[PDB]
Amino acid sequence: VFSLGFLIMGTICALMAFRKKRDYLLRPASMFYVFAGLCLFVSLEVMRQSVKRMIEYYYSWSFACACAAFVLLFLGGISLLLFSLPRMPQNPWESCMDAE
Amino acid sequence: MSPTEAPKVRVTLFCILVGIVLAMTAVVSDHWAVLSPHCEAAHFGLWRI
Amino acid sequence: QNPLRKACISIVEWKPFETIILLTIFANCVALAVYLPMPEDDNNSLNLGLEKLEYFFLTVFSIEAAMKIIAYSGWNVLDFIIVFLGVFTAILEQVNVVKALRAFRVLRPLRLVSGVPSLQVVLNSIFKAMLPLFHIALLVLFMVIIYAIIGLELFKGKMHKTCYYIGTDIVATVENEKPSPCARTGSGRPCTINGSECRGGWPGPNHGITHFDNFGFSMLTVYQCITMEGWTDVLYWVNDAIGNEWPWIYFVTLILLGSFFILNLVLGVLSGEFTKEREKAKSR
Amino acid sequence: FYWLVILIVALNTLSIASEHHNQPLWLTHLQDIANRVLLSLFTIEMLLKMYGLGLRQYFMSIFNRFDCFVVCSGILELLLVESGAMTPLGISVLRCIRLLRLFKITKYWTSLSNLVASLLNSIRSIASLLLLLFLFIIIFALLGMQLFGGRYDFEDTEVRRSNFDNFPQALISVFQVLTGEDWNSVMYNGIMAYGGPSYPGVLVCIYFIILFVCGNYILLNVFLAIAVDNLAEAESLTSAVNATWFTNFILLFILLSSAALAAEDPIRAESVRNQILGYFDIAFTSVFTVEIVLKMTTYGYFNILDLLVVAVSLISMVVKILRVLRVLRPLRAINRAKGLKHVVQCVFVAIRTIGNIVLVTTLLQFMFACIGVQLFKGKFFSCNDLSKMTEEECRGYYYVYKDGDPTQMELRPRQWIHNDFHFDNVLSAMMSLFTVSTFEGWPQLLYRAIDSNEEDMGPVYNNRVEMAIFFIIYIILIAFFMMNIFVGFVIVTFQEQGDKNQRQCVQYALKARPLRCYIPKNPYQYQVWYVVTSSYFEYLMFALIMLNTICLGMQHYHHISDILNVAFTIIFTLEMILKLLAFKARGYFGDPWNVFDFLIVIGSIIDVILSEIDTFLSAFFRLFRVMRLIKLLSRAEGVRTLLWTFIKSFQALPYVALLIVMLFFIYAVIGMQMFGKIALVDGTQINRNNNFQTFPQAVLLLFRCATGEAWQEILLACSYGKLCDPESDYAPGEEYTCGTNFAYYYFISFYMLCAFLIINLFVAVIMDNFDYLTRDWSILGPHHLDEFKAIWAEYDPEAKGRIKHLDVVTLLRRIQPPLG
Ligand SMILES: C#C[C@]1(C)[C@H](O)[C@@H](CO[P@@](=O)(N[C@@H](C)C(=O)OC(C)C)Oc2ccccc2)O[C@H]1n1ccc(=O)[nH]c1=O
Ligand SMILES: CCCCc1oc2ccccc2c1C(=O)c1cc(I)c(OCCN(CC)CC)c(I)c1
Ligand SMILES: [Ca+2]
């Protein structure tokens, strides 16, 4: 439920970023997505530990589902964070927080 | 303004939307932990088992 | 300062007196080289002979220092501190009728540099080629501290189980294998020796030296890994302790950053300083 | 006579190189006889030149100077042959001076004459720097003798050759630590000589750390200076189907096919995964077959590569050579990518540029291998127990006492073993010297050579300590001097291909843009902006970061850290609230460092909540508190600038790194095909942590080999003698048939290629940074212009072009005299 709350916060941040030239809000939304996915991964890890401490198990439908969800959220958040950041300077005159 | 309407950002946002909807649907589908005692396969999940 | 009442001993310095001092420094270095250390306060005839000869060098150095101080600097204070330590050790030795204080005698060869201007300016240049490396050294220390803390929080008290024999305190290994950590009912490594079992109470892999138990030992093993001399052993031991899925990230990233990137930085800065010095001296 | 004398020299070097251990009697007779005729020919050639050119001008060249020495030494040796020459080591060392006539091959290369002239000019500086280094080594050897001399009295039977018992051994140990090979074992021995891993015992590691750091710094200084300066003088005197969619699809298919090839199962020939991989491979080949036919219908050196790849793929729908020849698929990307082709061409041009040093180094290594053959021919044999000195004595069984206890016995058969790296012939000697030049296992070879007793006899402990001169001289000459010139050659060569200060300044002025400062209104918020932006706040929170780092290092194995964690988390959360209030969340996220702080504080809050919920009723979330002192980087301007410039240089040239990635990929796949069926046995170099069974394991093995670990041990671990894996499919009766002798080529070629590529990448990054690296920090630089931009933003909140004319007057006072 903490992870889905983080997802909700990220969704509202992304929605607010599009309107009235609020371009700066794409970074907090990406970070919220990253943390929500990370909570999801640690939740599935604790579930794997619980099923281990309980013969052999099998992952067919929902474990790969949750793993794909975690990978999608993590990679999407990281890519959005990297894309929102303007650029590496690469030039002595160029630097961050410049004039657009 | 430039990184808002970029197609790459749109692709990443679409992937994030797919991931979030998949995770939302996956919080109920408890079909990942199956234990065979050895015909007593179980369905272990977050909410209900 | 003082009038011509004591400065009657400044006339031999202009004479090639420094050559005799250089030769006696070389003789003292040779005497230091031929000394044979012995365990548990043992000696031979030669060591006793060299101990008596040590006073001959001390007297010469002391009279030379007293002769130069009366007639009259960074490199002369070094001679003074060496001679003071020598005379202090000689005084202490004959009144307590410790050997650790004798380690100061390895500073005598520095007087060879002190007596030759060529090595003097060479050492000066080598020191002068070190100031630009300050930022690199700061970055190295910063990375070492971060990686030591990360290893402290990740692998603390994990490499303390190895497979002993059944009911004995003997570590179970094979012909050409060093002892490695072990894990029972986990993701680590289970021991495959027949009459062996995994239990704790094990000081560590390298006689208790290589582990992330506290900050000092974590720093030591991180520094050892950064030199790339035995980092694979640490990685393999951590893999045996906890599993070979995560730790490779830590160790490979440490090797890539603290070893290759740092070496590239050092080489670049040194090459830049060398080229700058050559271009500055070209116009001269 | 030029070609005649070169032919005589070639015959002489062939006769020298033909000598080995247990050679037939006819070979010995021929080599004995061939010495006389060739010496006579040299004498005859000398006498003709004595009249052709005269007795006076013949001695004005060092080229013909040593010929007289060579011929007179040969005559003297031949005359003393008939005497009673005992001491086989002595007669061997008088056979060593017969090898100085190998320099007639070096005598023919005139392209090294410009370099050697600078060496002869700067011989005094070379000697001075080497003398300073030698004095440093002497001082540290004396210190080690004082510290660890006579303190290695361990009751166990373990042998520790690298000790400080006397001056030669202390010098050898200090040199070994200086080379960095197995220095940690020496450090462990020194630590355990004292109490051990206790408070006063571990402080002796300071000696080893200081020795390593200072010696490596001195070594870099001396050798880099010599190489770069002498090579600069040497060069200075020298100068006096067509759409982008289709090609993108093809490249994606190249990547997919490479990934499918990489993730195979070499151990199981018939497996579930292998069939799916074969289906994917034939599906990919079907697409590539319809792609080559399309190209040739519209057109008539790179397409034949695709044709050959498709042919060898379709031929599968020694009979397995073509199975390993499909590792050429990643090489299909060279033509598609212009940058990849350009960097491949550049590295080939660099390879062809460096051709003289490689040849002279190989030839000098050949002479050193000949000397090593003369010195250690047959002397690298041994028995299981060192009490049996001969092959006939080393038979039967003997007792082995484990842990040194005389009451714990075990029986082992006695076998006459031969060292893996020896000097029996020129090829084995060259392999041993190549292993030595990589600083891998060279102490073992050194100590085996010191104990070398006789032609067919076992070792004698500390028999010949003077044999360390050979190894030390070889390391200094080859692994130190010529290797540094090779590195220095690339540096100056790339510097050649690399006013201008005014051009850079005018380019900065033309292309500069102002940066935002975010001066806030609403004076109630202006007060919090003033308190936040004040240097006192940043000093206070730098102190708090330092305190948090200090508290983080206080944890140890065998609860107060919990409350301090919460306290620090709350303090940083209050920072985040205050910054958001001051910057109104608009300019706060414009700074990447503030984004990093947001990420760190959110991670720390989640970690604290997780710890609390665990206490009410995951290990890696604690790493967020470690990254807190990463934000300390924003205050160190020099460190941040250096990191930024080198990072952007690495970003600038990604194709040079892609060459290394492709090399690793190709070699890993080849290794899985070749050595993937070797069983994992403890006590060997192929085990659970080091193998070729999976692609990640092969890549890790190659990376370990790149970083100069025990790669020659891995090379020996795969040579046609290894037990095959039980799950692998092999015919019954034979199990010890896994491994190939191809491992020698594999590992040697990989080591050379990886070293060259890493050197190329490092020099490329250095030359990219050279604008910043060779910068005068006094005349003028971009830092002054950045400070001017900062003060402008101080006087101008928003960019909005320029500012009022009256406001221009005051800011020129703040401009430094170097700029204004
Ligand atoms: C001898 C020698 C060295 C002590 C060391 O053995 C070598 C390592 O790199 P390398 O073997 N290059 C290729 C094979 C490569 O892939 O590097 C990895 C294997 C590390 O050779 C040189 C590299 C740069 C300049 C000159 C030679 O550098 C020298 N060193 C290093 C650090 C230092 O602080 N002080 C120094 O003197
Ligand atoms: C097509 C690429 C060929 C590269 C190459 O060919 C050589 C022929 C003779 C001698 C050296 C080379 C060479 C190297 O690039 C090379 C080889 C070695 I070994 C080497 O030293 C590695 C070990 N090092 C200590 C870790 C010793 C200085 C270095 I640096 C570069
Ligand atoms: Ca090594």
Side-chain angles (χ1 to χ4, degrees), chain D residues 25-51:
Chain D
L25 276 313
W26 65 265
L27 189 38
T28 304
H29 291 343
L30 166 61
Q31 283 178 172
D32 181 14
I33 295 317
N35 176 46
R36 275 82 176 265
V37 291
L38 252 51
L39 188 61
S40 83
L41 256 70
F42 278 136
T43 304
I44 292 284
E45 181 66 29
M46 179 186 54
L47 296 175
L48 194 140
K49 296 282 99 175
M50 203 90 111
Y51 180 75

mmCIF file of all heavy atoms in Angstrom, chain D residues 25-51:
data_model
loop_
_atom_site.group_PDB
_atom_site.id
_atom_site.type_symbol
_atom_site.label_atom_id
_atom_site.label_comp_id
_atom_site.label_asym_id
_atom_site.label_seq_id
_atom_site.Cartn_x
_atom_site.Cartn_y
_atom_site.Cartn_z
ATOM 1 N N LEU D 25 73.058 -36.313 -29.391
ATOM 2 C CA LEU D 25 74.507 -36.148 -29.455
ATOM 3 C C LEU D 25 74.935 -35.458 -30.743
ATOM 4 O O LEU D 25 75.876 -34.653 -30.742
ATOM 5 C CB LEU D 25 75.197 -37.506 -29.321
ATOM 6 C CG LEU D 25 75.422 -38.046 -27.907
ATOM 7 C CD1 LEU D 25 76.006 -36.969 -27.004
ATOM 8 C CD2 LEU D 25 74.138 -38.617 -27.318
ATOM 9 N N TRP D 26 74.267 -35.767 -31.856
ATOM 10 C CA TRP D 26 74.632 -35.142 -33.123
ATOM 11 C C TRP D 26 74.387 -33.640 -33.084
ATOM 12 O O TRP D 26 75.163 -32.865 -33.653
ATOM 13 C CB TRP D 26 73.870 -35.790 -34.279
ATOM 14 C CG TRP D 26 72.384 -35.600 -34.243
ATOM 15 C CD1 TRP D 26 71.462 -36.460 -33.729
ATOM 16 C CD2 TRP D 26 71.647 -34.489 -34.767
ATOM 17 N NE1 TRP D 26 70.198 -35.951 -33.889
ATOM 18 C CE2 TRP D 26 70.284 -34.740 -34.523
ATOM 19 C CE3 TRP D 26 72.009 -33.302 -35.412
ATOM 20 C CZ2 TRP D 26 69.282 -33.850 -34.902
ATOM 21 C CZ3 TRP D 26 71.013 -32.420 -35.786
ATOM 22 C CH2 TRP D 26 69.667 -32.698 -35.531
ATOM 23 N N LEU D 27 73.315 -33.208 -32.415
ATOM 24 C CA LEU D 27 73.058 -31.777 -32.282
ATOM 25 C C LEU D 27 74.152 -31.094 -31.472
ATOM 26 O O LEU D 27 74.600 -29.998 -31.824
ATOM 27 C CB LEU D 27 71.690 -31.545 -31.640
ATOM 28 C CG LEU D 27 71.165 -30.107 -31.629
ATOM 29 C CD1 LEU D 27 71.527 -29.381 -32.914
ATOM 30 C CD2 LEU D 27 69.663 -30.094 -31.416
ATOM 31 N N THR D 28 74.592 -31.725 -30.381
ATOM 32 C CA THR D 28 75.675 -31.153 -29.586
ATOM 33 C C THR D 28 76.962 -31.066 -30.395
ATOM 34 O O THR D 28 77.665 -30.048 -30.354
ATOM 35 C CB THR D 28 75.895 -31.982 -28.320
ATOM 36 O OG1 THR D 28 74.670 -32.067 -27.584
ATOM 37 C CG2 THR D 28 76.961 -31.342 -27.445
ATOM 38 N N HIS D 29 77.280 -32.122 -31.149
ATOM 39 C CA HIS D 29 78.480 -32.100 -31.980
ATOM 40 C C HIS D 29 78.396 -31.012 -33.042
ATOM 41 O O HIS D 29 79.373 -30.295 -33.285
ATOM 42 C CB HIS D 29 78.694 -33.467 -32.629
ATOM 43 C CG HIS D 29 79.087 -34.540 -31.662
ATOM 44 N ND1 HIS D 29 79.577 -34.265 -30.404
ATOM 45 C CD2 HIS D 29 79.063 -35.889 -31.770
ATOM 46 C CE1 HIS D 29 79.837 -35.399 -29.779
ATOM 47 N NE2 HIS D 29 79.534 -36.399 -30.585
ATOM 48 N N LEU D 30 77.233 -30.871 -33.684
ATOM 49 C CA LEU D 30 77.067 -29.849 -34.710
ATOM 50 C C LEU D 30 77.194 -28.450 -34.124
ATOM 51 O O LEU D 30 77.840 -27.578 -34.718
ATOM 52 C CB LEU D 30 75.715 -30.024 -35.403
ATOM 53 C CG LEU D 30 75.209 -28.872 -36.271
ATOM 54 C CD1 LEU D 30 76.163 -28.601 -37.422
ATOM 55 C CD2 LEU D 30 73.813 -29.172 -36.790
ATOM 56 N N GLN D 31 76.591 -28.216 -32.958
ATOM 57 C CA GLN D 31 76.685 -26.900 -32.332
ATOM 58 C C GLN D 31 78.112 -26.595 -31.898
ATOM 59 O O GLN D 31 78.552 -25.441 -31.963
ATOM 60 C CB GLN D 31 75.729 -26.814 -31.145
ATOM 61 C CG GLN D 31 74.278 -26.606 -31.542
ATOM 62 C CD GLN D 31 73.348 -26.576 -30.350
ATOM 63 O OE1 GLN D 31 72.163 -26.275 -30.481
ATOM 64 N NE2 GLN D 31 73.880 -26.894 -29.176
ATOM 65 N N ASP D 32 78.848 -27.611 -31.441
ATOM 66 C CA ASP D 32 80.253 -27.407 -31.108
ATOM 67 C C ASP D 32 81.065 -27.070 -32.355
ATOM 68 O O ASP D 32 81.892 -26.150 -32.338
ATOM 69 C CB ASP D 32 80.808 -28.654 -30.417
ATOM 70 C CG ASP D 32 82.266 -28.510 -30.014
ATOM 71 O OD1 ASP D 32 82.793 -27.378 -30.027
ATOM 72 O OD2 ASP D 32 82.882 -29.535 -29.654
ATOM 73 N N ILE D 33 80.833 -27.797 -33.449
ATOM 74 C CA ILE D 33 81.596 -27.568 -34.673
ATOM 75 C C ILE D 33 81.212 -26.239 -35.312
ATOM 76 O O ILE D 33 82.076 -25.494 -35.789
ATOM 77 C CB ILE D 33 81.407 -28.745 -35.648
ATOM 78 C CG1 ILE D 33 82.010 -30.027 -35.066
ATOM 79 C CG2 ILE D 33 82.028 -28.433 -37.000
ATOM 80 C CD1 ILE D 33 83.364 -29.831 -34.419
ATOM 81 N N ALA D 34 79.915 -25.916 -35.327
ATOM 82 C CA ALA D 34 79.460 -24.689 -35.971
ATOM 83 C C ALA D 34 80.023 -23.439 -35.310
ATOM 84 O O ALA D 34 80.083 -22.385 -35.954
ATOM 85 C CB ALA D 34 77.932 -24.629 -35.973
ATOM 86 N N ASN D 35 80.428 -23.525 -34.042
ATOM 87 C CA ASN D 35 81.039 -22.377 -33.384
ATOM 88 C C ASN D 35 82.390 -22.040 -34.002
ATOM 89 O O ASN D 35 82.731 -20.861 -34.156
ATOM 90 C CB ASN D 35 81.188 -22.648 -31.887
ATOM 91 C CG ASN D 35 81.904 -21.527 -31.164
ATOM 92 O OD1 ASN D 35 81.605 -20.351 -31.369
ATOM 93 N ND2 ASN D 35 82.856 -21.886 -30.311
ATOM 94 N N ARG D 36 83.172 -23.060 -34.361
ATOM 95 C CA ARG D 36 84.510 -22.824 -34.894
ATOM 96 C C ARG D 36 84.454 -22.153 -36.262
ATOM 97 O O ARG D 36 85.150 -21.159 -36.504
ATOM 98 C CB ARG D 36 85.279 -24.143 -34.976
ATOM 99 C CG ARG D 36 85.972 -24.550 -33.685
ATOM 100 C CD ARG D 36 85.010 -25.240 -32.735
ATOM 101 N NE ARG D 36 85.680 -25.723 -31.534
ATOM 102 C CZ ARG D 36 86.134 -26.959 -31.377
ATOM 103 N NH1 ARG D 36 86.006 -27.869 -32.329
ATOM 104 N NH2 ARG D 36 86.731 -27.290 -30.235
ATOM 105 N N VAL D 37 83.633 -22.683 -37.169
ATOM 106 C CA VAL D 37 83.596 -22.161 -38.532
ATOM 107 C C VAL D 37 83.058 -20.736 -38.551
ATOM 108 O O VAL D 37 83.556 -19.882 -39.294
ATOM 109 C CB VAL D 37 82.780 -23.094 -39.446
ATOM 110 C CG1 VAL D 37 83.520 -24.403 -39.655
ATOM 111 C CG2 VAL D 37 81.402 -23.356 -38.861
ATOM 112 N N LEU D 38 82.047 -20.446 -37.732
ATOM 113 C CA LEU D 38 81.473 -19.105 -37.730
ATOM 114 C C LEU D 38 82.414 -18.101 -37.073
ATOM 115 O O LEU D 38 82.503 -16.948 -37.511
ATOM 116 C CB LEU D 38 80.113 -19.122 -37.037
ATOM 117 C CG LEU D 38 78.936 -18.964 -38.000
ATOM 118 C CD1 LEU D 38 79.046 -19.956 -39.146
ATOM 119 C CD2 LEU D 38 77.633 -19.166 -37.265
ATOM 120 N N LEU D 39 83.131 -18.522 -36.029
ATOM 121 C CA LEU D 39 84.154 -17.659 -35.446
ATOM 122 C C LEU D 39 85.260 -17.370 -36.453
ATOM 123 O O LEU D 39 85.744 -16.234 -36.552
ATOM 124 C CB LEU D 39 84.726 -18.306 -34.184
ATOM 125 C CG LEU D 39 85.678 -17.462 -33.337
ATOM 126 C CD1 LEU D 39 84.979 -16.214 -32.825
ATOM 127 C CD2 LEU D 39 86.224 -18.284 -32.181
ATOM 128 N N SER D 40 85.668 -18.387 -37.217
ATOM 129 C CA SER D 40 86.669 -18.178 -38.258
ATOM 130 C C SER D 40 86.161 -17.222 -39.330
ATOM 131 O O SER D 40 86.910 -16.369 -39.816
ATOM 132 C CB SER D 40 87.067 -19.517 -38.878
ATOM 133 O OG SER D 40 86.143 -19.910 -39.876
ATOM 134 N N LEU D 41 84.891 -17.358 -39.721
ATOM 135 C CA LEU D 41 84.316 -16.446 -40.706
ATOM 136 C C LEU D 41 84.280 -15.017 -40.183
ATOM 137 O O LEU D 41 84.560 -14.070 -40.928
ATOM 138 C CB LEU D 41 82.913 -16.908 -41.096
ATOM 139 C CG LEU D 41 82.768 -17.599 -42.454
ATOM 140 C CD1 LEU D 41 83.427 -18.968 -42.439
ATOM 141 C CD2 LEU D 41 81.301 -17.707 -42.844
ATOM 142 N N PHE D 42 83.926 -14.838 -38.907
ATOM 143 C CA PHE D 42 83.941 -13.502 -38.317
ATOM 144 C C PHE D 42 85.348 -12.922 -38.315
ATOM 145 O O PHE D 42 85.545 -11.741 -38.632
ATOM 146 C CB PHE D 42 83.380 -13.547 -36.895
ATOM 147 C CG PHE D 42 81.880 -13.517 -36.830
ATOM 148 C CD1 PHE D 42 81.193 -14.368 -35.980
ATOM 149 C CD2 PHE D 42 81.156 -12.632 -37.612
ATOM 150 C CE1 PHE D 42 79.813 -14.341 -35.915
ATOM 151 C CE2 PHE D 42 79.775 -12.602 -37.552
ATOM 152 C CZ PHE D 42 79.104 -13.457 -36.701
ATOM 153 N N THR D 43 86.344 -13.741 -37.964
ATOM 154 C CA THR D 43 87.728 -13.275 -37.985
ATOM 155 C C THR D 43 88.155 -12.878 -39.393
ATOM 156 O O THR D 43 88.804 -11.842 -39.585
ATOM 157 C CB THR D 43 88.655 -14.360 -37.435
ATOM 158 O OG1 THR D 43 88.232 -14.729 -36.116
ATOM 159 C CG2 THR D 43 90.089 -13.857 -37.379
ATOM 160 N N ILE D 44 87.795 -13.687 -40.392
ATOM 161 C CA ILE D 44 88.157 -13.386 -41.775
ATOM 162 C C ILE D 44 87.505 -12.086 -42.227
ATOM 163 O O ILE D 44 88.149 -11.237 -42.858
ATOM 164 C CB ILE D 44 87.774 -14.560 -42.697
ATOM 165 C CG1 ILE D 44 88.648 -15.781 -42.404
ATOM 166 C CG2 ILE D 44 87.884 -14.153 -44.160
ATOM 167 C CD1 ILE D 44 90.051 -15.677 -42.957
ATOM 168 N N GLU D 45 86.220 -11.904 -41.910
ATOM 169 C CA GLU D 45 85.536 -10.670 -42.279
ATOM 170 C C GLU D 45 86.155 -9.462 -41.591
ATOM 171 O O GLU D 45 86.233 -8.381 -42.187
ATOM 172 C CB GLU D 45 84.048 -10.772 -41.942
ATOM 173 C CG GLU D 45 83.239 -9.536 -42.311
ATOM 174 C CD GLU D 45 83.177 -9.301 -43.809
ATOM 175 O OE1 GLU D 45 83.250 -10.289 -44.571
ATOM 176 O OE2 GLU D 45 83.055 -8.129 -44.224
ATOM 177 N N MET D 46 86.595 -9.619 -40.341
ATOM 178 C CA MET D 46 87.239 -8.515 -39.638
ATOM 179 C C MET D 46 88.531 -8.098 -40.331
ATOM 180 O O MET D 46 88.819 -6.902 -40.467
ATOM 181 C CB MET D 46 87.515 -8.907 -38.186
ATOM 182 C CG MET D 46 88.202 -7.820 -37.379
ATOM 183 S SD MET D 46 88.680 -8.365 -35.731
ATOM 184 C CE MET D 46 89.631 -9.830 -36.126
ATOM 185 N N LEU D 47 89.327 -9.075 -40.775
ATOM 186 C CA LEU D 47 90.623 -8.760 -41.369
ATOM 187 C C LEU D 47 90.481 -8.052 -42.710
ATOM 188 O O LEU D 47 91.303 -7.191 -43.041
ATOM 189 C CB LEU D 47 91.452 -10.035 -41.525
ATOM 190 C CG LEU D 47 91.823 -10.735 -40.218
ATOM 191 C CD1 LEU D 47 92.538 -12.051 -40.488
ATOM 192 C CD2 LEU D 47 92.674 -9.824 -39.342
ATOM 193 N N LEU D 48 89.459 -8.400 -43.496
ATOM 194 C CA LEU D 48 89.246 -7.715 -44.767
ATOM 195 C C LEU D 48 88.885 -6.251 -44.560
ATOM 196 O O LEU D 48 89.350 -5.386 -45.312
ATOM 197 C CB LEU D 48 88.159 -8.428 -45.572
ATOM 198 C CG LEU D 48 88.032 -8.056 -47.052
ATOM 199 C CD1 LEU D 48 87.762 -9.295 -47.889
ATOM 200 C CD2 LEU D 48 86.935 -7.022 -47.264
ATOM 201 N N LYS D 49 88.063 -5.953 -43.551
ATOM 202 C CA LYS D 49 87.709 -4.566 -43.271
ATOM 203 C C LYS D 49 88.883 -3.789 -42.691
ATOM 204 O O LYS D 49 88.894 -2.554 -42.749
ATOM 205 C CB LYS D 49 86.511 -4.511 -42.321
ATOM 206 C CG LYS D 49 85.219 -5.087 -42.891
ATOM 207 C CD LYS D 49 84.539 -4.117 -43.854
ATOM 208 C CE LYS D 49 84.827 -4.456 -45.311
ATOM 209 N NZ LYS D 49 84.061 -3.583 -46.245
ATOM 210 N N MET D 50 89.873 -4.485 -42.128
ATOM 211 C CA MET D 50 91.045 -3.797 -41.597
ATOM 212 C C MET D 50 91.884 -3.178 -42.708
ATOM 213 O O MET D 50 92.568 -2.173 -42.480
ATOM 214 C CB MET D 50 91.892 -4.759 -40.764
ATOM 215 C CG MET D 50 92.780 -4.069 -39.743
ATOM 216 S SD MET D 50 91.968 -3.854 -38.148
ATOM 217 C CE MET D 50 92.901 -5.000 -37.137
ATOM 218 N N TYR D 51 91.846 -3.757 -43.907
ATOM 219 C CA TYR D 51 92.545 -3.186 -45.051
ATOM 220 C C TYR D 51 91.628 -2.379 -45.957
ATOM 221 O O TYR D 51 92.082 -1.413 -46.580
ATOM 222 C CB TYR D 51 93.221 -4.292 -45.866
ATOM 223 C CG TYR D 51 93.967 -3.782 -47.081
ATOM 224 C CD1 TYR D 51 95.187 -3.132 -46.949
ATOM 225 C CD2 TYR D 51 93.447 -3.951 -48.358
ATOM 226 C CE1 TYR D 51 95.869 -2.663 -48.057
ATOM 227 C CE2 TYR D 51 94.123 -3.487 -49.471
ATOM 228 C CZ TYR D 51 95.333 -2.844 -49.314
ATOM 229 O OH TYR D 51 96.007 -2.380 -50.419
#
